[PDB]
Amino acid sequence: RDLEVVAATPTSLLISWDAPAVTVRYYRITYGETGGNSPVQEFTVPGSKSTATISGLKPGVDYTITVYAVTGRGDSPASSKPISINYRTEI
Secondary structure (H helix, E strand, O other), X not given: OOOEEEEEXXXXXXXXXXXXXXXXXXXXXXXXXXXXXXOOEEEEEEOOOOEEXXXXXXXXXXXXXXXXXXXXXXXXXXXXXXXXXXXXXXO
């Protein structure tokens, strides 16, 4: 799987990823300021989608963004390998 920022502004972005081979219940999107000490933020995206908007970001900051797939067949790392990327918002 390959995650990418397809559209962005200094304060928000649109991410897109490849759906895994398995049926997904939902995805967990987590994001945080890279090298920051605040708790990561998290939101859910329905399993039928593969894009999501992230808002409330700060301009010119590096964020670590990760997607996790959760299946309705058992929760633990036994769902789907996380996909992550580092992306710096423009100024």
